[PDB]
Amino acid sequence: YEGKIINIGGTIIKARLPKARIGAFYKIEPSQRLAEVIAIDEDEVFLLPFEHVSGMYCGQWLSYQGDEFKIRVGDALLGRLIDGIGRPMESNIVAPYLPFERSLYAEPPDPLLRQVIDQPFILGVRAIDGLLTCGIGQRIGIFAGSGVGKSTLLGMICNGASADIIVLALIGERGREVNEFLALLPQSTLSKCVLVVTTSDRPALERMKAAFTATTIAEYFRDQGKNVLLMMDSVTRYARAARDVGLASGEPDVRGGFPPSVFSSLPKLLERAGPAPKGSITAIYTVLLESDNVNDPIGDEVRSILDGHIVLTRELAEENHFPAIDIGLSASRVMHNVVTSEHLRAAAECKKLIATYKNVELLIRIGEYTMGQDPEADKAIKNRKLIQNFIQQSTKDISSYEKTIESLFKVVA
Amino acid sequence: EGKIINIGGTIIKARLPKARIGAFYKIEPSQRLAEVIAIDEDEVFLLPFEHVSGMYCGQWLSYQGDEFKIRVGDALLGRLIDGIGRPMESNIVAPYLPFERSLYAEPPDPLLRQVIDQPFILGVRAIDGLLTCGIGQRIGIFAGSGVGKSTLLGMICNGASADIIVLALIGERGREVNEFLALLPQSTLSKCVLVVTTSDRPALERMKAAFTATTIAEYFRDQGKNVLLMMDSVTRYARAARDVGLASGEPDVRGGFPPSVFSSLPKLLERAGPAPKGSITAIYTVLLESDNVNDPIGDEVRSILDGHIVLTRELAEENHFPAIDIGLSASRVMHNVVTSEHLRAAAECKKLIATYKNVELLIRIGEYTMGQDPEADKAIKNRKLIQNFIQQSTKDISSYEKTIESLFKVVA
Amino acid sequence: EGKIINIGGTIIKARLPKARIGAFYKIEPSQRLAEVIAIDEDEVFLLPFEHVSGMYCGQWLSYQGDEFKIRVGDALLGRLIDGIGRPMESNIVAPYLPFERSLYAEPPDPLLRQVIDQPFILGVRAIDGLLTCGIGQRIGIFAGSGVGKSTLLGMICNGASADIIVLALIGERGREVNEFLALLPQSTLSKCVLVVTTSDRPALERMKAAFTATTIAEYFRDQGKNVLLMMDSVTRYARAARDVGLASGEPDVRGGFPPSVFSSLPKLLERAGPAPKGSITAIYTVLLESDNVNDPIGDEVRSILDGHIVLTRELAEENHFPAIDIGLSASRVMHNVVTSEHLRAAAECKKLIATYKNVELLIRIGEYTMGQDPEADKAIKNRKLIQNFIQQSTKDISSYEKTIESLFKVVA
């Protein structure tokens, strides 16, 4: 009715319709599918459809629907599954009464009202609680390569941690995993859990906006005054989808593909989850790397945005050392605030012993290390299988925070 | 309908007013086809089905059909199919197929997948004892060229047991078609559908042949059966999609590949798994652009599939066949499949292999004197048992009980 | 005075005939400002101050200013300012800033700069005992991600003795503005100006916060007092200017960066320093792309800046904090400042650290007979005194006399 699609191909369509506000979404008039305006030219507009692009033609019409795409949240979406658009997954249900329409692109809190975080957040993994330590309110990434440890460790965290609300986004991952995550969490956890599931099958728009849907639901349950744990599996799938859309919209390449829109819109997503006046969002994001190099474009940028990074390495997964986290290469930017100095000194000595043995281990496997001459290296070896039975852990085993730090004191000295 | 104005060599472009994208057109005098891949307000980009030589400007295009749907039915069992769905063996009568299916369908709904917990016996002791497969798991075989990908699919054709075996041979040798028919017995070839396009064919017919194999496997899944899909070199699909997408004017995001091969590979690989009725267990051969596993296609297909078996060239040079590197390999579904005792025995055998790989260069140089480590002497002592457990000949298959009891005898 | 013709991601384009550069316009339906960054002879490139929410074609523009100016004055202390210039705390009453200044001034005359002779007491034992800073020196702190740039500015800013501190937090997490105010006591918060912009803010606030901080520092310099300016990740300025200029029709040159970044960064980064009345002393945190050596924006900042502290994460992996690599870092302005015996003690224990970094191998390998290398014998005996002099705690600040006394007893 308003315009005509005049260019079909790739991820974006292009239309001819004047006076289009940017970000408004338009329905394809005979064929019930709709598309969001991402950019405008002097008369022609770039649109990104919500579904696949097959079956279209030149001069196909476009109707006007709304100024902004908004999702509809409420308190009646706990224990239920949502896609990236906002509509529910399951159809054996009656769909709930969600009363509050919320926009999808909001603001972070005032930087003066973001308090300092000084309470520990316990995950149940002995390594990430003893050596590193999370805090109630921070956001922390799990940086690994392909098929190393990210999902499993995130399942161990979901099984071990406990918040008032749990919002779990599975964006751009395999569809076989939505029943594994539903199997490894109990009904006492499922009663406070919202899944936002976008499979890797889906278009670029759903796989790009599922992260914002999960962040919007998490901040809705934050504004009621509760501590909500957000867990977002592969924020890099958002980064890939935004790369595809931004390159199809005609933007350059900076730092290995990845237009400036990606590095501009990652902080608009990641700054929305932290401490707040009412409640706080503790966030745990997993990051896939383009090799096992930690110095990726997206790996380095999301490492410079987040408040803690947990680096998992493949050469500790070749050795059946699970969870495969590299202690020397991973850090936790809030553990000097959330815990006493005695735990801090013990964790520092355990990190120093791990790095000392890794500095020595090469000249043990070629038979040149001589015992008794270096006092720091010897104590790095005499405790080696005493520190490692602390640092590696089974999947179905959760630990308490007390015997964790008691094992740490027993392991270091 | 319209006329052709450019011919480049991979894609052509034409003056077609208001063509549906995806609809296939016909070159009018010369009996060839093409399909629409992009539209530019009066000028469509077309990908021809056959070779491009002979065309001229202003050559006409006739219309037929809104999409290229293949013709499928129950009478495909025991016969060979072209990549776009023709019967290849022309010495026999054409089969009667009642149904039409388009090549691009949807995966099953994610809440209807029912996490897999039954084993799938392959016959190779290394992907039965140490790695284990599931009914519904899609597996990858990652190697360099010449390392043994096709030998191992030949080993697991005559050892595995499904209802319908759907074997795609896309992008591979024409000489292979008969050698894969020399491994299949008559009780197995009477239930096998073999979709083969070779490396000579145009880029479309190597692109749209994995989708043909998946559509035939989905038709045989939806009847209530168990399908064993196996593709040979899915990276040949990835390279056909690469040079078509780069001819179509698209940027180069990673290692030479457009983003339209990274967005179109999950909507191929995710259609092969568990289902509300039936199942497809799929095995994909993946060739790596060097011996490095961090090839972009190797990395992306490792991040999509449910288990990877990396074969190295060091073990192919050391005459360790099959050349499965155990530390680099994994199987996601094994902890739901095997018992706790079998999982413990598998983990301890893998730790023995890693311990010997630690002490190997130290004993090769000559520093290892017997007696310091308790695990290194265990590795040296069980070395020969582990080696003749992992190493297996081509004409040998094991049953699952003999595999697990030999695992228990080897591990301790 | 013109219509907007297209909206990009970061950029606006309009038809403003004979418009100047720097002339900022506001959008008539929507109250928000935008300044001109390029001309294309009828068609200008503007950069907006905010996001692009509803931006229809043909939206009008109205002339507001020929250049953008900020309100400065002496009644700015103890406050928080954003990159634009307006106060960021809203519960407080708005102050009275008397004067206005443009953000683009020129560095002082190089024949009228003073001579740096007296030290700037910094607080950390390594950058006082080994790399001493003078009053008027521009040093930079070079590291990768999360290696400890912001923690070292916390240690400096805690134990700083300057008459007025301007702290620029450019393009970093909103969380840490309260963590910097948690280690500013009231005696140094009553005379500090925080120019803070967060990483989610639009492109030119993140591009102009450095100019706002240097403008405020030059104002309080021209009053006549010495002032400490500390920028946190001027690399965020550099890649904000990269994303602005590179999307305005300007070519990649060395890292994705246009030539305009390399034209506008040595003018910003040099208008600090000594002066005929007053002196800005500046500490620039620099983020590096990789941990490599061929960084197109780290190398030339290293070249045009007199003194640099290099933090390497290979010392942050053995938990050696602060991770200062004393061999890779230098201070061109310390031989003019400290006494000669201070130079001898600093050079001697740098020599001891450099000796023990490779005598350490032939201690572990059992090849070191005592006495054959006496200097190494002096670098093994005093290893512990050095490694308590170098790394210190975050809350462990120390005065200058204790640092030089402990330096002398470490070297002796």
Added chain:
Amino acid sequence: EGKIINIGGTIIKARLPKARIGAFYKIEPSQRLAEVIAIDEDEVFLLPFEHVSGMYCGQWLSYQGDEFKIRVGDALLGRLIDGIGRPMESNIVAPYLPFERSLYAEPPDPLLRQVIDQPFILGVRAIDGLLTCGIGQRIGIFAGSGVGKSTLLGMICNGASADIIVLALIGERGREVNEFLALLPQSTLSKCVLVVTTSDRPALERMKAAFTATTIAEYFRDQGKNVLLMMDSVTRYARAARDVGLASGEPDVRGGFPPSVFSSLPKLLERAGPAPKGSITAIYTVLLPIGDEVRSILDGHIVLTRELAEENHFPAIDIGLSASRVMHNVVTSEHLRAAAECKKLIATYKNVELLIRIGEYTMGQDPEADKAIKNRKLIQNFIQQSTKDISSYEKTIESLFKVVA
């Protein structure tokens, strides 16, 4: 004389007919100027020196020239000069300058370069006792950061037997020009004519500073005077001409440098040699990619090292790996062989100090290292002195000949 088409950040495009590459044009309302890098059939890509803000569509460009030449005369001795040529300060008034010459002059071909004679005394006693240098010889100094090369340059300006001394502080920092001029006397400044430019200044005039200083030194070469040229940090000329080159548009070849700097640096360095009018002793400093290309292109490298400068042994030069290639054509055979035997008397100490760090080395048969141990301190106070310690040429000769005893 031409309207400005558009502004591309650092590139101006104009609509003006018939201009040559390198012609510099004039922004008339603001008094700024900008030179031509490329022409189209009627439009012209040129690039500004200064900042580009304040410019609009339709500003005029006054012609005022066709190539840039510097107004150079005899009265520039003792004045501060920009890389373009205008003075630095406004307290002094610009004197009479009759002549002007362009910045380009072709060097003679290398097949017929002259013989070197006539020892040229620099003032540091270490090299003119050990690594001497003639009049027309051009010398490269390879020093580091924090090695004390600025005092070395100030003390080879102070005590040189040259009537004119020309130095180009090309790309220096803000403080470092006063840091350098604080250690030059007034008797030296009344002999100097010196070009300064800072990293504030645009890369275009930061690369034309080298040609300006070379051109002024060629002017004082033609008046029958022995003249010394100094160019401090040739590498900063290299990065400035790099920024001009790939700012105009050119892909790089080696390191990050375009081949334009590899065509311009032998052209800039191959000139300024032994002319029959009384010639021009060039001293060019390079810090430690193109140091290979510089070290293979001029005769004589002097190496200053941090491993020697960590002690109090100034000037921080090591004779064991630096040598000026022309000494037999300069100094006599007695002085040459005595200097070379003192060089190998120093070089055998470092192969025997490490063997007397351990307790093994004795006397009895080693006639070259037993002499270094006794006659060490005369060596080690011959090859070092302070900043304002001058040692004339007719003292270092007999001092070196009583060092060899």
